[PDB]
Amino acid sequence: AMWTTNIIKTPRGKFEYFLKGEGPPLCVTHLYSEYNDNGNTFANPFTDHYSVYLVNLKGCGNSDSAKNDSEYSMTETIKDLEAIREALYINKWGFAGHSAGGMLALVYATEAQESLTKIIVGGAAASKEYASHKDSIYCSKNVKFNRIVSIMNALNDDSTVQEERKALSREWALMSFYSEEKLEEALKLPNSGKTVGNRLNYFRQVEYKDYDVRQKLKFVKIPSFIYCGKHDVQCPYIFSCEIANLIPNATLTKFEESNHNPFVEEIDKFNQFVNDTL
């Protein structure tokens, strides 16, 4: 039940990834996070039914670093994932992503759906318009906006002192969980996925302003399993509704007692969700 550490060489570079589980192949990654062999709490439930490939992207963990900023783009990321898939001699696999990882899932589908058995898309949006919605913490109309800007800026500073980083991370987590009890319990689970500054900066400064796949989603024909916490304050629930409506063969699963982290906030229901993607 341990995550295996792997290094794979491809024509597009060397990548570190972690394997756990038996069953159909499922790729899991995030747009700006790095993992270790503790695995990840979003990826872990899938290991009950899938062979899960938890990938460190360019600039993450022990994968190769980027020689140019363009290597961080979602398009280039998909090309990297496709090279990994090919190097594993896998014809088709699933892709599962949460939040920014969910946006990456949508781009995988629009660029290369023929390589995908399905997508699983959590707490995401089909365009940049989530950050202009008054129910998002990223929107200036939202009461939390000013505080969140301050927190994000401080967390993105490598000079921020340990005690301050600890406090800010706690504050962020509490905003991101419906139940304080569920947060405390989630912290006992093995986890990894530290923010990668290079990749976050690229998303915020370059990728975000051009992000919109709404029209292309109408031509995504693969099984698409969309989910979101009812109380998510990052990409509000309506944006998952939009995704599920636009994709012809999509389903939508609502997590009524979850904010941003249904996979640990409603473990039993999330397990049922995983089973239902098969």
Side-chain angles (χ1 to χ4, degrees):
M2 306 302 290
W3 289 88
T4 304
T5 303
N6 304 275
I7 303 285
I8 191 163
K9 281 192 171 178
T10 81
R12 290 186 58 90
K14 195 159 67 76
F15 298 88
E16 183 181 50
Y17 70 90
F18 307 88
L19 178 69
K20 183 178 169 178
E22 294 182 68
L26 181 74
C27 180
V28 173
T29 197
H30 187 263
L31 195 56
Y32 41 79
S33 302
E34 60 188 353
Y35 306 105
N36 60 46
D37 68 5
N38 289 121
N40 173 261
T41 52
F42 165 70
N44 206 222
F46 293 97
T47 69
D48 287 344
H49 299 287
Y50 291 92
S51 296
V52 181
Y53 294 82
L54 181 64
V55 180
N56 271 157
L57 297 176
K58 196 77 66 71
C60 303
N62 295 299
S63 300
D64 285 351
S65 299
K67 299 305 189 183
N68 55 254
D69 286 359
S70 64
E71 295 176 41
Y72 297 130
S73 75
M74 285 200 259
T75 297
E76 288 298 302
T77 301
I78 299 314
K79 299 177 176 296
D80 286 354
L81 293 173
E82 282 288 274
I84 294 168
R85 185 193 48 70
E86 291 281 334
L88 286 163
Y89 281 84
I90 289 170
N91 186 238
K92 291 169 73 172
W93 60 3
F95 185 90
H98 186 75
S99 197
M103 298 172 194
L104 184 59
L106 297 173
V107 178
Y108 209 147
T110 61
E111 291 275 304
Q113 62 176 308
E114 180 161 289
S115 299
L116 300 171
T117 55
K118 69 197 80 190
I119 53 174
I120 286 99
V121 186
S127 81
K128 66 175 181 182
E129 294 194 1
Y130 69 96
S132 290
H133 192 279
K134 67 182 197 59
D135 286 353
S136 175
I137 60 175
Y138 305 118
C139 177
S140 65
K141 296 169 181 176
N142 194 275
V143 72
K144 303 288 264 281
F145 176 83
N146 290 323
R147 183 51 185 164
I148 290 305
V149 167
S150 182
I151 294 171
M152 288 188 303
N153 290 348
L155 288 173
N156 195 214
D157 189 353
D158 289 329
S159 296
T160 295
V161 294
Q162 197 182 22
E163 283 307 301
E164 185 67 12
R165 183 171 293 280
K166 180 182 179 177
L168 296 167
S169 300
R170 183 73 173 193
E171 190 173 0
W172 189 276
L174 285 161
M175 176 198 63
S176 303
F177 274 78
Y178 168 86
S179 163
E180 297 197 356
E181 184 179 307
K182 292 306 183 182
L183 171 58
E184 216 49 43
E185 291 174 7
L187 289 166
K188 285 204 309 181
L189 299 170
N191 204 23
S192 70
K194 217 165 77 72
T195 303
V196 178
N198 281 152
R199 297 194 59 94
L200 174 65
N201 287 343
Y202 186 88
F203 173 71
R204 295 201 69 202
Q205 296 157 11
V206 181
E207 191 86 58
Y208 167 87
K209 62 182 185 63
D210 292 336
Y211 177 62
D212 188 3
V213 297
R214 286 172 292 179
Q215 294 300 321
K216 282 189 291 300
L217 289 188
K218 299 174 162 168
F219 302 97
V220 170
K221 308 311 294 296
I222 66 180
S224 301
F225 302 92
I226 319 305
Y227 75 84
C228 194
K230 177 186 186 167
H231 309 284
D232 204 338
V233 298
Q234 289 180 57
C235 297
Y237 186 72
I238 188 168
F239 293 94
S240 287
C241 292
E242 175 175 52
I243 292 163
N245 176 75
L246 290 173
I247 299 172
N249 304 121
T251 65
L252 178 63
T253 303
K254 190 174 202 177
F255 286 87
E256 313 279 354
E257 274 189 286
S258 296
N259 188 314
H260 191 70
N261 295 261
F263 40 87
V264 288
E265 296 183 77
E266 293 182 64
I267 291 168
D268 288 343
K269 186 170 171 164
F270 197 83
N271 283 335
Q272 187 53 49
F273 169 77
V274 172
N275 191 67
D276 290 347
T277 67
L278 292 170

